[PDB]
Write a protein that binds this DNA or RNA. Structure first.
Lengths: 92, 99, 105, 94, 533, 98, 84, 106, 94
DNA sequence: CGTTACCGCCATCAATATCCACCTGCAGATTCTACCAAAAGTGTATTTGGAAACTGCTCCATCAAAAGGCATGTTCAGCTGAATTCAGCTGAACATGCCTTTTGATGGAGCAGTTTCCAAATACACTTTTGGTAGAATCTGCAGGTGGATATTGATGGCGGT
DNA sequence: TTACCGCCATCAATATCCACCTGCAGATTCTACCAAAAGTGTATTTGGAAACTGCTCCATCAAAAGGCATGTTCAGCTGAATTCAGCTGAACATGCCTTTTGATGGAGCAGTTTCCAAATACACTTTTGGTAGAATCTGCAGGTGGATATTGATGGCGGTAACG
């Protein structure tokens, strides 16, 4: 077949479509779900996208305030806790 | 000669037990990294990301997804069902108040 | 001569708790017994969560406490779950639970 | 190379009284540190707000005792209050 | 004109380009040397891309939109053939093809054409002239003569005698015959013959398109070769009345009147095979031959002002003057259907209204027992109608048996059928003890089983076991002779084989509504011309 | 005898109560229950009238919100009648139960 | 003071019905009411205690509406119009 | 003789919010422009909420703003609803909303 | 009697500016006061946390601006930031 | 009434992967010594915040009455919730192909540590303006009752098709 | 050729909307006094902006690999269709207790004064916790033999129905 470069050259799948079908399947199965509708995944993908701008933007709002262009895990923890989604283990 | 085939549901429950007894991350590292990078460049370009920040955000993401999926399972069971469909997600996010 | 934690029969540092209270801008003045009382409360909470985690590890045939054991200990205690109902444990997972309708026959 | 304060050796020390033959991992130890910090922050904030509401300019053992009674569930709160009172009495008689 | 086509053709190319980044590999010419193995030109004889399409549409090499569509479809075919199926390139090609289909139809429909899909016929199995019972499966090498005679691998060594040596062209079974084009005399435009329903017999003067007909304010001449003009028979009239009454009491808004005609009826005889002839006939236990009457039927509907055939029939009727056990029996040899009936929901029920209507007819004549073989055709096999549509699902044995049972339950509710059962229960019902006691029908599965087993009182238990394996497949219906209808000789459709041969020769297929209407009108013309001659 | 079909009067009074804001709980039984609960917590306790009114109004608002959630959850289950599993699921998803 | 008992029944069936209707509920099963009462009780058990817990912290014996605002705010049920 | 409230072109009190910030023990030091920023933000929020309340009152043929109008204004704006998602309004009621299936299904 | 501070008159002028002929009731006015005060402690706590994160002992307009972006959603956030920036510039221009 | 063959249920066995512990190298956890800025403990003078003591005083608890907006109990049938059946079909399980993912190594964009120093923040004493607010007077949007024109529901007359 | 369910048409019994009119608690306008703020004006102090720079670690890129993406067939799913015992809604009679207006003893909240134990601010000495390097120990992650445990397939036996 067709050769050439391939590694990191075929990011073709859209940004949110980066998460694979079996990945969302595994996330649903861990929640005790045993059967998934075919068109659930993309919707959850959209839901996932929403969560991102719930936290990342706020974390970005932290990072720009500290005169930093590199985001830290402490910024992420503060952004998570400010929405009531406290995370432990990354406060060091 | 019609080889062995598990009935639908046995393997599902088995792997559900497997993943509930385990704690490893399920989302692959590279696609999630690309997603985070792209949605960050949506807000601010030329950003750099710490490995610890990325892994913390990822872990929070699988926690949020597993919680919403458990709520979705409860919602699907609530309507005398076993399969999840979009209105279950909608009801879960509505009761959570995000929508 | 004697540290405040030793004088109060506690293992957590009373002086560090007092310093953190002072630096947190919570109040202009902090009482003498407040850091002792808070250190005692923290020590009790740590001791009981560690006891439950060790019990879970022993039930799991393990002698080292892992975040999975901490999650099992916290979620299996009703009041600990209530206290940490809005707290996410890293690398902890969820309790094994299958609903009745999902079960076969 | 600034000193990063953490309750680490203290909590591990507490482990020695509760499980002499049981260890702890680094990730779980950071979990322990974050838990202790969060509980401390909650208790301190509740004590501060109780002090502010009553026009009280000093935070004593009574204020944080009330904070623990508000935040911590029933028998956990009772045990925490009892051990805090015992520690305060021991410190006073020290 | 080059500029004339652009305003319509360009949006499809823009939509193809809009697919990002799946369409990127197709934007530029694919260089065999650049991407690796240089065998691209060896496999793909004529490489082309999207840039070549843009250049052709700019300069104006395209004269008709069909050239543009053919080039796009040939691009898709090249991409599918060269690249492997599981490759992402194949998936991108399929997605681009789907995007092209979901816009090409209205665009070129605005230009006066009917549809913009390159239609290729179904992979239908070919028959053999020598053995008469051998078919050529898919992905199998065969030998063809003038695309008219076919021989398989086994039949090459079976024929005695070569009757030049290097005169038959070696071919492969991947060839799909293109659709024929007819040109309007007044306009000169060539377009597919099927969508215009133009036949050389009805209109020998020439072909006139709808645009030219509307230009002169004149309509096409009436067609006297319709299903309603076919001779009427008592059984056909009965079935027509039954279907019309059912559709009238249903009162479906989309329902249309259905015409049923019997175009063939002839007396034949079935001869006992050598094994049973030697074992029973010579001993005098059973006669050598069984006489019967075979009757062939079709069902038609008036859709869009055009006759369309949607149901077929082949039956064998052993009357009261036939030696037992075949006396007063009817056997359904083959039946076929086309699912373009309107409305769809009543369609299935309408089929019952035929079969039940048949059972009510012979019951009045004196026939007491009916025999049905629920054997659905395999993949690629067509019973009566040629090239069933790809979206026509072939019923499974279980579903087909449930359908048969359902009509029989409805008939019993209608008092027409006394009862129905499987063949083993009938064998218990008459205490079968010899192979002769079983009915003997031409082309039936049981005569072949008996022959093979004789080649293999053992007969009784053997045949009972064979009843046990395939009892649910075969239905025996107990209901409880002078036939009013005369004999109708028709060599064209006498047997499904000649009809299938005619359909294959003239490409009279049923893959689409327009193709099915063209086939139905072709058979109407052929039947109206065979009776005269 | 004139009788409306089941649901017409229900919709009428639902609109009536959605256009009104007055408290639907009488003050006295709620105050008595609050006194009982406080006495179980601490005896010899006194209540401001404003505190009782605030308790009652907050409880009414919380019940209205949980009833919105319960109704929409019942709509999810292709039903128009609420049965305690709706309230249980709503409270569980809200985090008040699990 | 007299020890009041069994006043959860004071939240009458029509009252629970009215609160459900204000929530847009159209049909109520027979076993809804008492269930809500228990949930109602739980909510009071969630708030009153905390408000009561405020009272002795001020060395008072009367519960004020301001401590009510404090408890509702600390339980994520912030209320307006009664101070704070 | 110019106050800091009028100096910033604001209606809300700069000095009062500065004093409240100092009294709240939020930080050991408070910037000079901090009370000005608080006054501007609070005045803006009050401005839009009062404008929406007045629009709701006009929609109800009322010239006096009532808590029902406040609830109508807050819940009809997605941003204000998100801002006050965990706040219950006194005597405000709820938005008129009946689900589809609850309507007659003739 | 001890003075009970409130924002009655300032919100009254705001209402007059946005609606000269529209009044306010006492209960709704209390709702307005409670809302503004609640916004006050929310923004103050956010600014204090921002000061604590960077070890900053002084809260300036920039910290409050960041906290506003954290708290206020979208168009409200940008408009409040613009209005506050204009007010700060006017204050520092005198 | 007798005999036999079908259908259903139960006993019995081939096979797969999901377990189990055992075993071994090892990243990671634990133990000990040394150094030491950073806290931590002790001493002494200063300040002050809140305890006690009495009392002014607001509203919190408690008892009286009455009549009417609703709580409580009963009926019936309208119809929504619950149980049963079955057919289209969407997902589950699985073999096939290979590719995107994972791990390790390597330049410099900025994250942090050090130092100067100045615009900017407390601290406080007067001084002036101004926001709570007792008190009396006038204004005013709408609570509440009345009446009748305007929607909303339901099934009554009869025409009609299944 | 008598009864039954829909429909589009009118019509009668009701809840809704609303304009109108009157009493009045509440909203808005002044007069006045005012302690608590607001703010300008110096002295003092320090938070952090600015400039230079060592040290991370983050983006980029190489190959090795344990996974994921499609197609096939089918047991089970979900929902449409049907039927029905049953209940909760509408109506109504009866009356329970509400709902507010009223007054009153006094427990208790809060203001004012005095004043001492405790918190604070340094100043000093001491243990001590966090980090870096060595080295011994070790719980448990890949393989791997092993008993065992589950489950769908198949054959055999008995119940039963049907024909003679």
């Amino acid at each position: 077949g067709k050769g050439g470069a391939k590694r990191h050259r075929k990011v073709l799948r859209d940004n949110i479509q980066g998460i694979t079908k079996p990945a969302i399947r595994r996330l649903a199965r861990r929640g005790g779900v045993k059967r998934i509708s075919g068109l659930i995944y993309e919707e959850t993908r959209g839901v996932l996208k929403v969560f991102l701008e719930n936290v990342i933007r706020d974390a970005v709002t932290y990072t720009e305030h500290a005169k930093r262009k590199t985001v830290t895990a402490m910024d992420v923890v503060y952004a998570l806790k400010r929405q009531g989604r406290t995370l432990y283990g990354f406060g060091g | 000669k019609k080889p062995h085939r598990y009935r639908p549901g046995t393997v599902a429950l088995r792997e559900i037990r497997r993943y509930q007894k385990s704690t490893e991350l399920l989302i692959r590292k590279l696609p999630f990294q690309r997603l985070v990078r792209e949605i960050a460049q949506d807000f601010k370009t030329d950003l750099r990301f710490q490995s610890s920040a990325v892994m913390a955000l990822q872990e929070a993401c699988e926690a949020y997804l597993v919680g919403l999926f458990e709520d979705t399972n409860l919602c699907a069971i609530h309507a005398k069902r076993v399969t999840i469909m979009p209105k279950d997600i909608q009801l879960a996010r509505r009761i959570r108040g995000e929508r | 001569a004697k540290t405040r934690s030793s004088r109060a029969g506690l293992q957590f540092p009373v002086g560090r708790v007092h310093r953190l209270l002072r630096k947190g801008n919570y109040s202009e003045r902090v009482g003498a017994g407040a850091p002792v009382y808070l250190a005692a409360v923290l020590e009790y909470l740590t001791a009981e969560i560690l006891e439950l985690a060790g019990n879970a590890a022993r039930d799991n045939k393990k002698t080292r406490i892992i975040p999975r054991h901490l999650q099992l200990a916290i979620r299996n205690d009703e009041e600990l779950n209530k206290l940490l109902g809005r707290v996410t444990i890293a690398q902890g997972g969820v309790l094994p639970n299958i609903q009745a309708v999902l079960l076969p026959k | 190379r600034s000193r990063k304060e953490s309750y680490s050796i203290y909590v591990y020390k507490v482990l020695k009284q509760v499980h002499p033959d049981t260890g702890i991992s680094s990730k779980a130890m950071g979990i322990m540190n974050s838990f202790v910090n969060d509980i401390f922050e909650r208790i301190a904030g509740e004590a501060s707000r109780l002090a502010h509401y009553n026009k009280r300019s000093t935070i004593t053992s009574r204020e944080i005792q009330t904070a623990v009674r508000l935040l911590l569930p029933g028998e956990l709160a009772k045990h925490a209050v009892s051990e805090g009172t015992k520690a305060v009495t021991k410190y006073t008689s020290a | 004109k080059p500029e004339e086509l652009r305003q319509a053709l360009m949006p499809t190319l823009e939509a193809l380009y809009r697919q990002d980044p799946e369409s990127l590999p197709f934007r530029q010419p694919v260089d065999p040397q650049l991407l690796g193995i240089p065998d691209y030109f060896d496999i793909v004889k004529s490489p082309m891309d999207l840039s070549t399409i843009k250049r052709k549409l700019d300069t104006g090499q395209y004269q008709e939109p069909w050239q543009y569509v053919d080039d796009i479809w040939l691009m898709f075919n090249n991409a599918w053939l060269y690249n492997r199926k599981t490759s992402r390139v194949y998936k991108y090609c399929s997605k681009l093809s789907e995007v092209f289909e979901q816009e090409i139809d209205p665009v070129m429909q605005s230009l006066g054409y009917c549809c913009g899909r390159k239609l290729e016929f179904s992979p239908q199995t070919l028959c053999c002239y020598g053995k008469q019972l051998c078919t050529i499966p898919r992905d199998a090498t065969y030998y063809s003569y003038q695309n008219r005679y076919h021989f398989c691998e086994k039949c090459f060594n079976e024929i005695q005698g070569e009757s030049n040596k290097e005169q038959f062209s070696k071919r492969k079974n991947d060839t799909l015959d293109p659709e024929l084009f007819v040109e309007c005399t007044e306009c000169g435009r060539k377009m597919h013959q099927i969508c215009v329903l133009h036949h050389e017999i009805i209109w020998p003067a020439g072909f006139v398109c709808d645009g030219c007909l509307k230009k002169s304010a004149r309509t096409r001449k009436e067609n006297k070769f319709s299903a309603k003009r076919l001779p009427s028979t008592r059984l056909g009239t009965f079935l027509e009345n039954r279907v019309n009454d059912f559709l009238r009491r249903q009162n479906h808004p989309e329902s249309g009147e259905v015409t049923v005609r019997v175009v063939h009826a002839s007396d034949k005889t079935v001869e006992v095979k050598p094994g049973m002839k030697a074992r029973f006939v010579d001993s005098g236990e059973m006669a050598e031959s069984f006489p019967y009457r075979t009757k062939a039927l079709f069902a038609f509907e008036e859709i869009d002002g055009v006759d369309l055939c949607f149901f077929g029939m082949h039956v064998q009727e052993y009357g009261s003057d036939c030696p037992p056990p075949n006396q007063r029996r009817v056997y359904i040899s083959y039946l076929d259907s086309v699912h373009f009936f309107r409305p769809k929901c009543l369609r299935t029920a309408v089929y019952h209204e035929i079969l039940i209507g048949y059972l009510e007819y012979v019951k009045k004549l004196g026939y007491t027992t009916g025999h049905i073989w629920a054997c659905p055709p395999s993949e690629g096999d067509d019973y009566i109608f040629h090239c069933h549509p790809p979206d026509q699902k072939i019923p499974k044995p279980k579903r087909l048996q449930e359908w048969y049972k359902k009509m029989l339950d409805k008939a019993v509710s209608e008092r027409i059928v006394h009862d129905y059962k499987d063949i083993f229960k009938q064998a218990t019902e008459d205490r079968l003890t010899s192979a002769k006691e079983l009915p003997y029908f031409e082309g039936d599965f049981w005569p072949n089983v008996l022959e093979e087993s004789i080649k293999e009182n053992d007969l009784s238990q053997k045949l009972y076991a064979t009843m046990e394996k395939h009892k649910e497949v075969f239905f025996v219906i107990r209901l409880i002779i002078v036939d009013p209808d005369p004999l109708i000789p028709c060599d064209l459709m006498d047997g499904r084989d000649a009809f299938l041969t005619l359909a294959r020769d003239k490409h009279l297929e049923f893959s689409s509504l327009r193709r099915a209407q063209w086939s139905t009108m072709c058979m109407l013309v052929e039947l109206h011309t065979q009776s005269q001659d």
